[PDB]
């Protein structure tokens, strides 16, 4: 068992916004992504616009100040740090991708569900139905659901 948050109230802040999408659409994607995980754990997430958030959400390009440099369009879409102070928990999205609300480019909501998985302490899954599977492939946003493996994983960490 890797690191977990030692509390059930977790804040997040959106550090900056991709110009690919409407600001409102980014907020919505991120809030809905947290809700996916809140729905199956005791965890609650609140957005703050100021103060010290646990999970910072960042859009950045290439070498962006950590040891997980991005690679331009394609390849790595995002990465996130597991639970911990400071950079711990933070989720970084590669601005060289084209973020969308839909099936074109890279869907932000789906990517955020996967990354928040990491921010909460999950690693990758070999279950092809799992949101924690290593590779992205668009699935209908309206019928999207965590797989049994994702739920097992997160319930083993919290609750
Ligand atoms: N399929 C790919 O290879 C895409 C390219 C973009 C595309 O094909 O549209 N890149 C990626 O998949 C890279 C690969 C990194 C590697 O190991 O080197 N992975 C990442 O960047 C991890 C982020 C990630 C993984 C899975 C999902 C997802 C989406 C819907 C349902 C279930 C899971 C969302 C986000
Ligand atoms: Ca943090
Ligand atoms: Ca990339
Ligand atoms: Ca972009
Ligand atoms: Zn980073
Ligand atoms: Zn991942």
From Swiss-Prot:
Ca(2+) 2 binds at residues 54, 86, 88, 90. Ca(2+) 3 binds at residues 71-72, 74, 76, 94, 97. Zn(2+) 1 binds at residues 64, 66, 79, 92. Ca(2+) 1 binds at residues 20, 95, 97. It is found in: Secreted, Extracellular space, Extracellular matrix. Zn(2+) 2 binds at residues 114, 118, 124. The active site is at 115. Induction: By exposure to bacterial lipopolysaccharides (LPS). Inhibited by dexamethasone. Found in alveolar macrophages but not in peripheral blood monocytes. Transmembrane segments: none annotated. Belongs to the peptidase M10A family. May be involved in tissue injury and remodeling. Has significant elastolytic activity. Can accept large and small amino acids at the P1' site, but has a preference for leucine. Aromatic or hydrophobic residues are preferred at the P1 site, with small hydrophobic residues (preferably alanine) occupying P3. The conserved cysteine present in the cysteine-switch motif binds the catalytic zinc ion, thus inhibiting the enzyme. The dissociation of the cysteine from the zinc ion upon the activation-peptide release activates the enzyme. This is Macrophage metalloelastase. The gene is MMP12. The chain holds residues 106 to 263 of 470 of the full protein.
């Amino acid at each position: 068992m890797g690191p977990v948050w030692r509390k059930h109230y977790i804040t997040y802040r959106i550090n900056n916004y991709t110009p690919d999408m409407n600001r409102e659409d980014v907020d919505y994607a991120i809030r809905k992504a947290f809700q996916v995980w809140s729905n199956v754990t005791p965890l609650k997430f609140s957005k703050i616009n100021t103060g010290m958030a646990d999970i910072l959400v960042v859009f950045a390009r290439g070498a962006h100040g950590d040891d997980h440099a991005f690679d331009g369009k394609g390849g790595i879409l995002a990465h996130a740090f597991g639970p911990g102070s400071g950079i711990g928990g933070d989720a970084h999205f590669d601005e060289d991708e084209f973020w969308t609300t839909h099936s074109g480019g890279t869907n932000l909501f789906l990517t955020a569900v996967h990354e928040i998985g990491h921010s909460l302490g999950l690693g990758h899954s070999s279950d092809p139905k799992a949101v924690m599977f290593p590779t992205y492939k668009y699935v209908d946003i309206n019928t999207f659901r965590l797989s049994a493996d994702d739920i097992r994983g997160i319930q083993s960490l919290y609750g």
